[PDB]
Amino acid sequence: VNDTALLTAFKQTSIKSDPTNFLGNWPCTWRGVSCSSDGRVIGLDLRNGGLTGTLNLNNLTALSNLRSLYLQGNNFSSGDSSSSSGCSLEVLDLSSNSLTDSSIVDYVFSTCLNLVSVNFSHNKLAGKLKSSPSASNKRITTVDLSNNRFSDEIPETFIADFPNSLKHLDLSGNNVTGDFSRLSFGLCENLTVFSLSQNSISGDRFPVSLSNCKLLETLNLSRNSLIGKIPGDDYWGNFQNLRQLSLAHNLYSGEIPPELSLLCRTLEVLDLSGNSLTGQLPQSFTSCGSLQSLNLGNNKLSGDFLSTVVSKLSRITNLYLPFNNISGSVPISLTNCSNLRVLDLSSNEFTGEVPSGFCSLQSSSVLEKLLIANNYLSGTVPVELGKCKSLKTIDLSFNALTGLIPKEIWTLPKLSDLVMWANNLTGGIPESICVDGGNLETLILNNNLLTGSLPESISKCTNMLWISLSSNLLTGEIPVGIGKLEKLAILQLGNNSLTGNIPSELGNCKNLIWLDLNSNNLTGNLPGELASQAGLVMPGSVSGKQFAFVRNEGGTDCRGAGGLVEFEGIRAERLEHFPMVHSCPKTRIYSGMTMYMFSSNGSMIYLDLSYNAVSGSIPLGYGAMGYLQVLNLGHNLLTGTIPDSFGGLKAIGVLDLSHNDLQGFLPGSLGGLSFLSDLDVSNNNLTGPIPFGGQLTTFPLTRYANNSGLCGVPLPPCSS
Numbered sequence: 001v002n003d004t005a006l007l008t009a010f011k012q013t014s015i016k017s018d019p020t021n022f023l024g025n026w027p028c029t030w031r032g033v034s035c036s037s038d039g040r041v042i043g044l045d046l047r048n049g050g051l052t053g054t055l056n057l058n059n060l061t062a063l064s065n066l067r068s069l070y071l072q073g074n075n076f077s078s079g080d081s082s083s084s085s086g087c088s089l090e091v092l093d094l095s096s097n098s099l100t101d102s103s104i105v106d107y108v109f110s111t112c113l114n115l116v117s118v119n120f121s122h123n124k125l126a127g128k129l130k131s132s133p134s135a136s137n138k139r140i141t142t143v144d145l146s147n148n149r150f151s152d153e154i155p156e157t158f159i160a161d162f163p164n165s166l167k168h169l170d171l172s173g174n175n176v177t178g179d180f181s182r183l184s185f186g187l188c189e190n191l192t193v194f195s196l197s198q199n200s201i202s203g204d205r206f207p208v209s210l211s212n213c214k215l216l217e218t219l220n221l222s223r224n225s226l227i228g229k230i231p232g233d234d235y236w237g238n239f240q241n242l243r244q245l246s247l248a249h250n251l252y253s254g255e256i257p258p259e260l261s262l263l264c265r266t267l268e269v270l271d272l273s274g275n276s277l278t279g280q281l282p283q284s285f286t287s288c289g290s291l292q293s294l295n296l297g298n299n300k301l302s303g304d305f306l307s308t309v310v311s312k313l314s315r316i317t318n319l320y321l322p323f324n325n326i327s328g329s330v331p332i333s334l335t336n337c338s339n340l341r342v343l344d345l346s347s348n349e350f351t352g353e354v355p356s357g358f359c360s361l362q363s364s365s366v367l368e369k370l371l372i373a374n375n376y377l378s379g380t381v382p383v384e385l386g387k388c389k390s391l392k393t394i395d396l397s398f399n400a401l402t403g404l405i406p407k408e409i410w411t412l413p414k415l416s417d418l419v420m421w422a423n424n425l426t427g428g429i430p431e432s433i434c435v436d437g438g439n440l441e442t443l444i445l446n447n448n449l450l451t452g453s454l455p456e457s458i459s460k461c462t463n464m465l466w467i468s469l470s471s472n473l474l475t476g477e478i479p480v481g482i483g484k485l486e487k488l489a490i491l492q493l494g495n496n497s498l499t500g501n502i503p504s505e506l507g508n509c510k511n512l513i514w515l516d517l518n519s520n521n522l523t524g525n526l527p528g529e530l531a532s533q534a535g536l537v538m539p540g541s542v543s544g545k546q547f548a549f550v551r552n553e554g555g556t557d558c559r560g561a562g563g564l565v566e567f568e569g570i571r572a573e574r575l576e577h578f579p580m581v582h583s584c585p586k587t588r589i590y591s592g593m594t595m596y597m598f599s600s601n602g603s604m605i606y607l608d609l610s611y612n613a614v615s616g617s618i619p620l621g622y623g624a625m626g627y628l629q630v631l632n633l634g635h636n637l638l639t640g641t642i643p644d645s646f647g648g649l650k651a652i653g654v655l656d657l658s659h660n661d662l663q664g665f666l667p668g669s670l671g672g673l674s675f676l677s678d679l680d681v682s683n684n685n686l687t688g689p690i691p692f693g694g695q696l697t698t699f700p701l702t703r704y705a706n707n708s709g710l711c712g713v714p715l716p717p718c719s720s
């Protein structure tokens with residue numbers, strides 16, 4: 001069994017697909033294989049090779065001298081059981097694969113006594129935790145079981161049963177359970193990084209052994225169900241080296257113990273967000289000269305501690321306090337934080353004016369992100385913000401601002417996200433956008449009082465992902481240059497007074513997936529190029545953004561098919577009381593993060609053109625939109641017939657064609673539409689039988705009413 005042969009064996013009895021030809025030259029000359037001088041294999045590096053196969057580690061460990069095995073970033077599944085061979089690995093990397101049989105972990109823990117670092121992260125390893133590395137293993141230092149599918153309670157001695165040289169143990173990203181106080185860390189020597197984050201571990205007390213981890217640098221216990229008070233008193237003196245602590249998204253309550261400031265000699269990161277903490281950051285925390293990231297969001301904190309305490313922290317660079325009860329005016333002492341790059345105070349009870357002193361710092365300010373959404377700020381957008389040349393994101397939405405958008409905002413060089421919807425801002429969009437100022441990714445100013453037209457200059461914002469200007473007082477034509485924005489994914493211009501034709505150039509927007517021009521004054525014909533991207537849409541950087549969708553539940557009497565709104569830093573409760581939510585008698589609020597449902601070769605997703613004066617026939621190409629979930633062409637002057645191609649709108653759930661002048665029959669293929677949950681073809685001149693398949697026979701009468709001779713259930717039968 002020569003080493004040269006085993007790899008070829010592995011290549012034939014494992015690899016199922018090599019679309020990149022990563023092994024075409026297949027001992028030492030081969031790709032990924034590193035050799036020693038004596039002519040023995042000691043390393044196999046096949047990371048990110050797009051390999052599809054079935055890994056059985058015993059066929060690689062047969063190699064006598066193999067100590068390095070990199071298979072991370074592939075599509076390897078788990079193979080048969082062990083053929084009983086000897087292991088010599090020191091480094092093993094099986095990350096980002098499709099392993100499922102966790103026996104591969106029991107084998108590496110039983111054998112592989114020279115194992116230094118192992119990583120199974122981002123696989124599908126299932127089952128309960130059981131085996132810890134062999135006691136004969138005297139070198140293992142880092143072990144990463146994170147982001148798998150492990151289950152059930154953790155063994156009481158699991159962590160403690162690790163060799164004494166362990167330094168880094170990552171168990172985050174599974175669904176293990178258990179009262180945390182019953183878990184033993186043992187003497188917990190040499191341990192510096194430990195994470196149980198993102199599991200279902202309960203516990204109202206910490207285990208006593210944890211206090212033995214005197215060398216701990218990162219303690220991450222976030223996204224569990226730990227309850228009670230944060231351990232105070234002298235407890236945090238055990239961790240004289242702790243640099244990062246996270247107790248976020250647990251069930252902790254009470255005040256933040258002043259004794260937690262024992263970590264302030266070395267603490268660099270604290271995340272206590274997502275609990276039910278009250279009071280303020282105790283004054284004792286002034287000694288945190290090393291703290292860089294303070295995240296206390298989604299709690300119930302209040303008081304003046306931003307000024308009494310946080311302003312005294314010099315190394316602060318990332319400050320998060322959104323979703324709290326902090327009232328009053330924003331403190332100006334926060335400018336004494338000279339190294340502050342990101343600041344988030346959204347969803348508090350702030351009053352007064354926008355903070356601006358950050359920019360007139362004796363030096364240039366490094367502030368890049370300023371977020372104060374869902375507060376009660378008033379006045380105008382300070383022109384002083386134009387001095388913060390490092391600014392990239394500005395979120396002032398859902399305040400009570402008024403006045404114009406200063407020229408100095410639109411010329412901030414690095415600006416990227418300009419977000420101030422749900423205010424009373426006036427003025428227009430400069431003709432000098434993205435030319436003298438930053439090339440934006442998001443321009444979200446819906447529900448304001450802006451006026452004028454949309455500058456043709458918008459064509460210069462080639463990085464644009466999301467435009468929202470709905471419910472303003474805009475006029476003019478939609479500039480044809482919009483078609484140059486090939487990264488533009490979302491475009492909302494509803495509830496304005498726009499005139500002209502729908503530009504054919506919209507079809508050049510390669511990534512456009514959401515188009516809302518409803519309730520304007522547009523004329524002309526439906527451009528056929530709006531579907532010219534069906535089956536070609538690539539996903540893009542617009543994904544991963546907080547949104548909320550308010551579904552108007554009032555048929556066609558309610559204008560538009562709902563409301564999609566950017567929702568960073570905003571409370572749902574504040575939306576459910578927005579009068580535009582009362583615009584429809586009945587509503588439901590969906591919320592989440594923007595996420596494509598196709599990896600490539602997609603189509604448009606949302607199209608609302610209702611309440612205009614567009615005329616002509618429905619372009620047949622519109623039936624090709626396979627991922628289209630909404631099509632609202634209602635309330636126009638459309639003529640002709642409903643294309644039978646509409647039978648290929650497999651993803652559609654809402655289809656509004658009412659209050660037009662459509663003739664002919666309903667395509668029978670609509671019956672094949674398995675997600676069609678809301679159809680309205682009433683108030684046309686449609687005729688003939690209603691398609692007998694799908695949900696079309698169960699809809700209310702009002703969805704077919706006022707036509708010229710429709711028949712069939714739910715209408716009277718056509719034969720009488």
Ligand SMILES: *[C@@H]1O[C@H](CO)[C@@H](O[C@@H]2O[C@H](CO)[C@@H](O[C@@H]3O[C@H](CO[C@H]4O[C@H](CO[C@H]5O[C@H](CO)[C@@H](O)[C@H](O)[C@@H]5O[C@H]5O[C@H](CO)[C@@H](O)[C@H](O)[C@@H]5O)[C@@H](O)[C@H](O[C@H]5O[C@H](CO)[C@@H](O)[C@H](O)[C@@H]5O[C@H]5O[C@H](CO)[C@@H](O)[C@H](O)[C@@H]5O)[C@@H]4O)[C@@H](O)[C@H](O[C@H]4O[C@H](CO)[C@@H](O)[C@H](O)[C@@H]4O[C@H]4O[C@H](CO)[C@@H](O)[C@H](O)[C@@H]4O[C@H]4O[C@H](CO)[C@@H](O)[C@H](O)[C@@H]4O)[C@@H]3O)[C@H](O)[C@H]2NC(C)=O)[C@H](O)[C@H]1NC(C)=O
Pocket residue numbers: 172173195197198218220221222223244245246248249269270271273274293294295297318320392416541544591592593594595
């Ligand atoms: C422990 O451990 C843990 C784990 O376990 C961790 O955690 C982590 O962390 C991290 C950090 O980073 C993160 O990541 C990140 O994130 C972000 C986002 O975030 C957000 O969100 C998320 C999500 O959420 C979700 O999920 C969850 C769970 O799963 C839940 O809970 C929720 O609810 C949700 O869910 C939802 O959704 C989903 C999806 O869709 C679905 O499915 C469901 O159903 C629903 O619907 C989260 O997670 C987060 O959280 C956070 O935060 C918060 C607030 O803050 C808090 O509370 C928490 O705790 C956390 O925290 C954190 O953070 C913070 C701040 O914030 C701090 O402070 C602390 O410390 C911590 O850390 C939130 O909410 C994003 O953004 C990202 O992404 C990024 O990155 C990546 C890589 O990694 C890439 O790829 C991408 O793209 C991006 O990037 C960016 O950035 C960069 C830089 O770096 C660059 O490069 C790029 O470009 C970008 O940029 C930007 O910008 C620019 C300009 O500048 C432009 O251009 C562009 O375009 C853009 O825009 C990431 O991913 C994660 O997430 C976490 N996880 C967890 C689990 O949590 C921690 O860390 C630890 N700790 C310690 C150690 O201490």
Ligand SMILES: *[C@@H]1O[C@H](CO)[C@@H](O[C@@H]2O[C@H](CO)[C@@H](O[C@@H]3O[C@H](CO)[C@@H](O)[C@H](O)[C@@H]3O)[C@H](O)[C@H]2NC(C)=O)[C@H](O)[C@H]1NC(C)=O
Pocket residue numbers: 300324325573
């Ligand atoms: C700290 O701030 C939070 C967040 O703003 C406050 O919680 C909110 O308090 C209002 C008070 O009316 C709650 O509204 C009530 O809720 C239910 C309907 O959900 C109903 O029983 C009442 O008619 C009323 O509308 C609101 O739901 C609540 N928000 C959340 C997310 O729980 C809190 O009151 C503030 N605390 C102090 C001491 O100021």
Ligand SMILES: *[C@@H]1O[C@H](CO[C@H]2O[C@H](CO)[C@@H](O)[C@H](O)[C@@H]2O)[C@@H](O[C@@H]2O[C@H](CO)[C@@H](O)[C@H](O)[C@H]2NC(C)=O)[C@H](O)[C@H]1NC(C)=O
Pocket residue numbers: 497499520521
């Ligand atoms: C832009 O369009 C609005 C509204 O017109 C559309 O709706 C109204 C019904 O609301 C309907 O009458 C019209 O045919 C379109 O479907 C215009 O404002 C409306 O003007 C009509 C004129 O009869 C008045 O009866 C309405 O009260 C008035 N307002 C509303 C809310 O309807 C507006 O004039 C148009 N602007 C331009 C520049 O064309």
Ligand SMILES: CC(C)[C@H](C)[C@@H](O)[C@H](O)[C@@H](C)[C@H]1CC[C@H]2[C@@H]3CC(=O)[C@H]4C[C@H](O)[C@H](O)C[C@]4(C)[C@H]3CC[C@]12C
Pocket residue numbers: 490514547549551590593594595596605629652653654675676677678
């Ligand atoms: C920008 C993209 C990525 C998106 C923001 C994406 O992330 C969202 O998931 C987006 C596609 C989701 C969020 C809200 C959804 C609608 C909510 C709703 O009330 C439903 C009622 C009924 O069930 C109908 O049949 C289908 C309806 C209309 C849904 C269509 C799909 C929507 C729009």
Ligand SMILES: *[C@@H]1O[C@H](CO)[C@@H](O[C@@H]2O[C@H](CO)[C@@H](O)[C@H](O)[C@H]2NC(C)=O)[C@H](O)[C@H]1NC(C)=O
Pocket residue numbers: 009010013014054055056058059079080083
């Ligand atoms: C690991 O090597 C063993 C030993 O060659 C492989 O087991 C054989 O697989 C072939 C092909 O499927 C069968 O015909 C034999 O009956 C198997 N047993 C033997 C030879 O004793 C095994 O398939 C290899 N595993 C992987 C994942 O490559």
Ligand SMILES: *[C@@H]1O[C@H](CO)[C@@H](O[C@@H]2O[C@H](CO)[C@@H](O)[C@H](O)[C@H]2NC(C)=O)[C@H](O)[C@H]1NC(C)=O
Pocket residue numbers: 017052053075077098
């Ligand atoms: C990764 O490999 C898995 C199998 O391990 C592939 O999943 C199969 O893909 C075929 C099409 O090639 C489907 O017919 C099967 O139903 C799939 N099986 C399972 C269990 O999902 C998967 O396509 C591969 N992914 C790649 C190469 O990106």
Ligand SMILES: *[C@@H]1O[C@H](CO)[C@@H](O[C@@H]2O[C@H](CO)[C@@H](O)[C@H](O)[C@H]2NC(C)=O)[C@H](O)[C@H]1NC(C)=O
Pocket residue numbers: 471472495519559580583
């Ligand atoms: C479109 O935007 C306008 C902006 O004025 C909204 O008009 C509001 O309508 C309500 C109806 O109850 C009035 O109470 C408000 O006073 C109006 N706003 C203002 C600023 O006067 C309208 O609701 C939006 N939606 C549509 C037309 O469907």
Ligand SMILES: *[C@@H]1O[C@H](CO)[C@@H](O[C@@H]2O[C@H](CO)[C@@H](O)[C@H](O)[C@H]2NC(C)=O)[C@H](O)[C@H]1NC(C)=O
Pocket residue numbers: 534535536600601
């Ligand atoms: C998915 O998109 C790809 C993009 O590559 C399409 O395939 C290529 O399209 C480009 C133009 O973008 C042509 O120059 C290539 O000749 C195409 N290659 C092919 C077809 O192999 C692909 O057609 C799209 N798929 C669907 C279902 O629309």
Ligand SMILES: *[C@@H]1O[C@H](CO)[C@@H](O[C@@H]2O[C@H](CO)[C@@H](O)[C@H](O)[C@H]2NC(C)=O)[C@H](O)[C@H]1NC(C)=O
Pocket residue numbers: 682683702703705706
């Ligand atoms: C079908 O058309 C009739 C006639 O226009 C509609 O009845 C009108 O309803 C509006 C508001 O609902 C009233 O202001 C009118 O006075 C009504 N006219 C008559 C003659 O009664 C009816 O609502 C339409 N049906 C649907 C489902 O839209």
Ligand SMILES: *[C@@H]1O[C@H](CO)[C@@H](O)[C@H](O)[C@H]1NC(C)=O
Pocket residue numbers: 164165189190
């Ligand atoms: C582990 O800790 C023990 C006792 O403190 C020490 O002797 C040993 O050298 C440490 N091992 C490593 C690899 O640091």
Ligand SMILES: *[C@@H]1O[C@H](CO)[C@@H](O)[C@H](O)[C@H]1NC(C)=O
Pocket residue numbers: 398399400421422423424447
């Ligand atoms: C505009 O001002 C009025 C003043 O009464 C206020 O009620 C309204 O909420 C403001 N608009 C917003 C916050 O979008």
